[PDB]
Amino acid sequence: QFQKPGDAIEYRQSAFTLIANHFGRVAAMAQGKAPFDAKVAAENIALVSTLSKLPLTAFGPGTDKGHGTEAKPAVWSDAAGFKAAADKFAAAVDKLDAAGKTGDFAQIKAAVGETGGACKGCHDKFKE
Amino acid sequence: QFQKPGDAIEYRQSAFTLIANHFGRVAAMAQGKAPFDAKVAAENIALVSTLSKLPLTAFGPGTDKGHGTEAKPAVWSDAAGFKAAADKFAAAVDKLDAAGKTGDFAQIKAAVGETGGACKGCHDKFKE
Ligand code: HEC
Ligand code: HEC
């Protein structure tokens, strides 16, 4: 779906930006920085879940260069490591999605922690 | 929630990028440039619909300068005009959503044309 490799880069960056913004709204409630509203949390979680399925589809062959990319070469040269990182994130987001549907603060908070750990674990190995 | 103007600008840009990509996938089918797959068209339409509701929430006061923005000052000095352009888009996206639900190629093609017109109409007045 990307005509030029720059397109894949801008797409994945864009998806990550939207994920970070909506995930951050949920995290703010989990951290007690904003009052908890289960409906609003659920809406933001649903968006995170939808968006989470997008960026990791945009690291195809030849999408490694330029356009302000912060993807490390290891994304392509340690593809197994990158896939493990992606799968850990998908598993955490599944739990987050389930938590959003229950409206249980504790379950949401636990899943925010797991999800955030997956963001960081991938970035440590694969993002500048 | 945007902490600084840069955050609003990056968010809206990011959402428009994702919108353009998924909309373009549908458009390619409608224009007779790719085979028609109604399920895939519906999935991309549903994403467009979800996404369409995001960027126009990120043009608050003071988000008019810097950070690579291409928003024209008229976004804020003709707020009613910008809102009219946004509402025209939203109405077109409603029709695109309806078309995704039916799977009707002709209805999808009509809605792609209308939606595209709404992108262009807003850009002509409000985007550098
Ligand atoms: C690997 C499996 C990742 C997971 C899981 C998450 N992110 Fe990440 N992210 C990853 C890479 C390789 C990059 C660089 C993309 C590029 O081509 O430049 C990023 C980038 C981001 C960004 C910056 C986007 C930009 O500046 O344009 C953000 C804000 C971001 N990622 C956030 C983020 C969050 C909140 C995550 C968990 C919910 C997350 N990412 C997971 C790789 C991976
Ligand atoms: C006004 C009501 C708009 C409608 C409807 C659409 N877009 Fe637009 N778009 C608009 C503005 C004011 C801007 C500039 C945003 C900024 O702060 O820079 C944009 C930008 C884009 C972009 C570029 C994004 C980037 O990465 O910088 C794209 C790709 C884009 N818009 C596409 C697009 C499509 C496909 C639309 C219809 C489906 C559409 N936009 C509607 C204003 C408006």
Swiss-Prot record, chains A, B:
Modification note: Binds 1 heme c group covalently per subunit.
GO cellular component, one term: periplasmic space
An individual GO BP term: electron transport chain
Keyword ATP-binding among UniProt keywords: no
List of residues binding heme c: R12, Q13, T69, E70, C119, C122, H123
Record's keyword terms, sorted: Electron transport, Heme, Iron, Metal-binding, Transport
Pfam family, one: Cytochrom_C_2
GO molecular function: electron transfer activity; heme binding; iron ion binding
Function of the molecule: Cytochrome c' is the most widely occurring bacterial c-type cytochrome. Cytochromes c' are high-spin proteins and the heme has no sixth ligand. Their exact function is not known.
Protein name as catalogued: Cytochrome c'
Organism the protein comes from: Rubrivivax gelatinosus
Taxonomic classification: Bacteria, Pseudomonadati, Pseudomonadota, Betaproteobacteria, Burkholderiales
